[PDB]
Symmetry: D2
Amino acid sequence: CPLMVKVLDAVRGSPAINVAVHVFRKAADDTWEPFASGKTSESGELHGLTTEEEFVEGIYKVEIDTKSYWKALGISPFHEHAEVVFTANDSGPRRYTIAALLSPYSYSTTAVVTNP
Amino acid sequence: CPLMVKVLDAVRGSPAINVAVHVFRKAADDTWEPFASGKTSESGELHGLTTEEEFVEGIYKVEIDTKSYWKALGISPFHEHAEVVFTANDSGPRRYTIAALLSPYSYSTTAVVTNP
Amino acid sequence: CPLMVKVLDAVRGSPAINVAVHVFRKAADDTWEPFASGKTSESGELHGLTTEEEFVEGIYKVEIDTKSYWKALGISPFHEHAEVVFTANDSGPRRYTIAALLSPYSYSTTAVVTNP
Amino acid sequence: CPLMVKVLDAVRGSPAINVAVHVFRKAADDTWEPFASGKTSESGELHGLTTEEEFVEGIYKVEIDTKSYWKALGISPFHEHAEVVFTANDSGPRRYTIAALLSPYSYSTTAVVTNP
Ligand SMILES: Cc1c(Cl)cccc1Nc1ncccc1C(=O)O
Ligand SMILES: Cc1c(Cl)cccc1Nc1ncccc1C(=O)O
Ligand code: NA
Ligand code: NA
């Protein structure tokens, strides 16, 4: 699998567990079409979203449902969700990790792109 | 000025100047309607986007055009843009500062919310 | 004011008020000598730490007393403090803003450096 | 091993490879005594720094030698190093991951503390 998502909690110092993640691919008419989805594991990670054959070049959006995560902890958050929008490019390294670090009023996101 | 956007560059240690910003508001049919737009000044700040009268309750999306910023400086970055999606004014009028700190493969965003 | 410190709270979406800050400068025997100190105001900012005359070339350490900040709000955080260590004025006088964004188990820090 | 260090590069979107890391423990006279050290691997990770028997409660400092990392890439950085100072506590979960995300003029750090 060429795409993994990892989510961390900056308030508790822990993985962010059971967070819903939705991935979309941009269609030719500029709409966002559902591509893959899941929930983070006990390690904060979501594996197996796609395959090499399916993950062709194009623009993708990863939506992390942060508002529901904070509400289940009893904490009032700012954002509706965190959105990560990027182009997949076959020239570059082949494995994409999209990571996010969550606080109630802030988030940080980075990409780690590597070649096995 | 109940909505201000501030952008910093983590590579240069400077304000991020001339960054385009587009704000949208979710309409009653669930589409994103254009609401306001502008670009950051020499201080990295974008003022004057809206007014207390026009900035009603709603779900707003602040799109910060990070790719165009980096490409103008000769850098091929990861993200298409940074998107900040939040509900505003649901407990009455507030003042919002949306800030972002930019790197080629990462960004952080936070909100400062005050009650005038 | 060639040195300013700004601190934000990522849990509340607000300035971090009443945060103690201690600045040190490395001496010719390699020890950290006390240089200046203060606390952040209602805006999260600490002004007036030093002057253009006293802020000579050197290696400086800005210690932001994050643990004491969180403990006063009822939160047991991870870090003792946040430390920012940098060489200043090695190409002539500059103005430095040291900013930090705080969560219980995380912090981000960045510098804005300008030439007056 | 109860302590792991992980370092990421926000400019290149990659692990930060071959970064020197030094760990110190605070002594009774308030000085910092060398405890363990190493260099990050090709995955940006440094394993095997200590053992359960040796990693007793106390105050520790993790110094990440970011300045040398950026200089070897040809990039002028701001900080001398990144410093992470924290108390180890036997009550909490048993495995500490200290992670840092590096840019030339900024860094973010978080702790992930979990129980096997
Ligand atoms: C310091 C910082 C980090 Cl580390 C990350 C994101 C924004 C900021 N800065 C701000 N964020 C919100 C409002 C104001 C600022 C500022 O730096 O003036
Ligand atoms: C340490 C950190 C910060 Cl400070 C901010 C955002 C992500 C991370 N962590 C990661 N980011 C990307 C890929 C992996 C990780 C990780 O911590 O395993
Ligand atoms: Na309401
Ligand atoms: Na010089």
